[PDB]
């Protein structure tokens, strides 16, 4: 049994990040920190936690800044830093509660990216990392308009919308496309120019300071991902320095592997892999 704590900490710009702290029944074994996507939160995660939890690992999953229950208005951002920030102060929180554990940072899509961003500024700050289809080349995901619109706005006017998102490719179960259509706290907007920016920030140094990743890293992704296409995941495991990184593809799988149908064998995936290496 896995339980849940709600709590805040004050991110960047004084902004109220809410995040939650899933604690199991056993001695901790590690502490996972986990970044959600653009536009959802971190209670889209309750499952990831439980099974992270049935093996002895405590969550932490913050709702980034103009998401789910935090602060600050919806999906805006001016700099990849203000992600980042916010994901290094909770990162400390689940250091300073659980020192002696392990620490893995992991990170879905948006959160994929806002990662591997922490994750090559303090390479030694953390032990491993997990990517779910992250989004760290977002210029190959935009048109040149877009990019040089989100590039020359998202700081001046960050919530301006420069792209459409298609929601229904993020599962092939029309379920979980329902249950995302019909949540009063997700985004159903257009990509707004702050996210744009900060995501070509990652995507566009992608390559020379991926060499500085050495820690161990696993990648999930789906082949049919049509949101973020998987060849965008098979090239970071080229450039990345870490001889211990994997790109685990799930055939026909869409873009949420952590939703999908087989999301029980992906997470039995994450699991063996994390429990092998503390």
Request: with cysteine; net charge negative; proline share 6%.
């Amino acid at each position: 049994t896995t339980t849940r704590t709600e709590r805040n900490f004050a991110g960047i710009g004084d902004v109220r990040i809410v995040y939650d702290v899933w604690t199991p029944d056993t001695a901790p074994q590690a502490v996972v920190v986990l970044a959600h996507g653009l536009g959802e939160h971190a209670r889209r995660y309750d499952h990831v936690a439980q099974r992270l939890g049935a093996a002895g690992l405590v969550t932490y999953a913050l709702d980034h800044r103009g998401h789910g229950r935090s602060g600050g208005a919806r999906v805006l951002v001016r700099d990849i830093s203000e992600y980042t920030a916010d994901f290094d102060t909770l990162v400390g929180i689940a250091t300073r509660e659980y020192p002696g554990c392990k620490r893995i940072v992991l990170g879905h899509s948006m959160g994929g990216g806002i990662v591997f961003a922490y994750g090559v500024e303090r390479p030694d700050n953390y032990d491993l990392m997990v990517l779910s289809a992250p989004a760290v080349a977002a210029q190959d995901l935009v048109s040149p308009v877009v990019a040089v619109a989100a590039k020359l706005l998202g700081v001046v006017v960050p919530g301006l919308p420069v792209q459409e998102l298609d929601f229904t490719a993020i599962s092939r179960d029309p379920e979980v496309v329902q249950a995302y259509n019909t949540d009063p706290l997700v985004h159903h907007g257009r990509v707004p120019a702050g996210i744009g920016r900060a995501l070509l920030q990652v995507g566009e140094t992608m390559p020379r300071r991926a060499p500085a990743l050495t820690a161990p890293l696993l990648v999930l992704h789906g082949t049919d991902d049509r949101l973020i296409p998987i060849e965008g995941s098979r090239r970071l495991v080229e450039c990345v320095g870490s001889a211990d990184v994997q790109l685990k593809e799930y055939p026909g799988l869409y873009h949420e592997v952590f939703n999908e149908p087989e999301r029980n064998q992906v997470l039995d995936d994450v699991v063996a892999w994390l429990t092998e290496r503390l």
